[PDB]
Structure formats: C-alpha cells, structure tokens
Design a protein around this ligand. Structure first.
Ligand SMILES: O=C(NCCO)c1cc(-c2ccc(F)cc2)cc(O)c1O
Ligand SMILES: [Cl-]
Ligand SMILES: [Cl-]
Ligand SMILES: [Cl-]
Ligand SMILES: [Mg+2]
Length: 214
C-alpha cells in the first residue's frame, strides 16, 4: 500500500493551495499532529529556523537531508529573489516526494535536489554545481553524519568566515559528537536554541555553529 510520505503529499495536494508555501507547511503540520507523526522539522523548531533565515538572508543554502521537503519549503519561501537552496536526499522515494512538494508549493525554481549521499555529493559541489562557498547549511540527515560531513565541507573549501551551520535534532535523536566538536572548536561560534521534537511534548533543539575560518 501507500507510504506515510505519499499520504503526507496527497494530504497537502488536497488541503493546501497550489503555490502557497505557508498553506503547505500548515497542511503538513496538521496532518502530523492529527493523523500520523513524521520526522519533519515541524512548526516549533521551524519558527526558530525562520528567525535564523531572516537574520542572515543567505544567498546559497545547502540542506543535508530533505525527507518530504518541509524544511526546504520553510527555507525557500523566505529566500530573496534569485537565492538558491540545494538539498541532498539519499533516499529516492523521499527525493521524489520532496520534488513534488516543492512543485506544489511553487518553489521549484529556488531549490535543486541532489540524489545521493551527502558524502558523495559534497566533493562535487564546486566543479559540478558551480558552488564557491556556502552561506548556510541545514543539517537534518542521519545523525551520525553531522560531524563527518561538517569536516568534509571544511576540507572541500565550502565554508567561509560567517557560514552558518544550523543542525536539527541535536538532543533527540541527538548528535553528541557533532555538538562536542563544534562547541569545543575555536573555528565555530555556537548557540543552542532549546525547543521541542516535532509534534511532541519532548525536548529537542537546534544548534547554530558559525564558522570562523581555520
Ligand atoms: O532520522 C532523522 N532524519 C534523517 C532521515 O530523514 C530524524 C529522526 C527523528 C526521530 C526519529 C525517531 C524518534 F523517536 C525521534 C526522532 C527526528 C528528526 O527530526 C529527524 O530528522
Ligand atoms: Cl523536514
Ligand atoms: Cl538523510
Ligand atoms: Cl511542532
Ligand atoms: Mg530532523
């Protein structure tokens, strides 16, 4: 039968307005509160994301892990005209949901999906995707990948002074190595934003880690 992700897409298509990102976010959050939990960033942490995006107005954002496109919708709706989001989604079924979610929201021209594993695609960003450096990175993929992929971004020359890392789920499921690393490194200036796990009365949080150079 259908998957939960297909059910979320369908709900959005039937309960949101085409081309209205806000209605799409609302539809997802309604579905996930009333029908079935799902691992979208959600509205609590989403509001914090929004506040960070507005502060920095990034021109080029990289997202690690798309899921159904909630966070990509959340971020892309607030980008300035001409700004871009690249999202890396290794799961092909998730990638297809995400594309369709973005298309329904009318944000397709702002966002590119890269299908494959972050560790494989990050080294291609400069030469294949014509990236210089990133303004912001949203980490929301497998939690054991946050640290290695941060170190890989640095190796590949993709971080500049002031690049904003924003990491989901630093408390649940948790990213203990990543947190220890960035909080102990003089190359990062970190802030913790305490919140709640999407759609649940369980504490979670976002970590912002601003790259300071070598
Ligand atoms: O696995 C995650 N992400 C990568 C695949 O898309 C993920 C997991 C959870 C979560 C799961 C199970 C639980 F019991 C609590 C949290 C939450 C999230 O926000 C997530 O991003
Ligand atoms: Cl999400
Ligand atoms: Cl992932
Ligand atoms: Cl929520
Ligand atoms: Mg998450």
């Amino acid at each position: 039968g259908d998957t939960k992700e297909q059910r979320i897409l369908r709900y959005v298509q039937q309960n949101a307005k085409p081309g209205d990102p806000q209605s799409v976010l609302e539809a997802i959050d309604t579905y996930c509160t009333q029908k079935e939990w799902a691992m979208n960033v959600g509205d609590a942490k989403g509001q914090i994301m929004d506040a960070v995006i507005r502060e920095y107005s990034p021109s080029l954002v990289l997202e690690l892990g798309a899921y159904c496109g909630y966070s990509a919708v959340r971020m892309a709706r607030l980008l300035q005209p001409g700004a871009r989001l690249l999202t890396m989604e290794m799961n092909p079924d998730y990638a297809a949901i995400t594309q369709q979610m973005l298309n329904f929201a009318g944000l397709q021209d702002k966002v590119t999906i890269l299908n494959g594993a972050s560790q494989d695609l990050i080294p291609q960003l400069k030469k294949k995707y014509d990236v210089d450096t990133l303004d912001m990175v949203f980490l929301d993929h497998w939690k054991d990948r946050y640290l290695p992929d941060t170190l890989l971004l640095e190796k590949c020359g993709l971080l500049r002074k002031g690049t904003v890392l924003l990491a989901d789920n630093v408390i649940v499921p948790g990213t203990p190595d990543f947190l220890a690393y960035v909080r102990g490194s003089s190359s990062f200036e970190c802030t913790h934003y305490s919140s709640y796990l999407e759609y649940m009365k369980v504490v979670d949080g976002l970590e912002k880690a601003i790259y300071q150079g070598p």
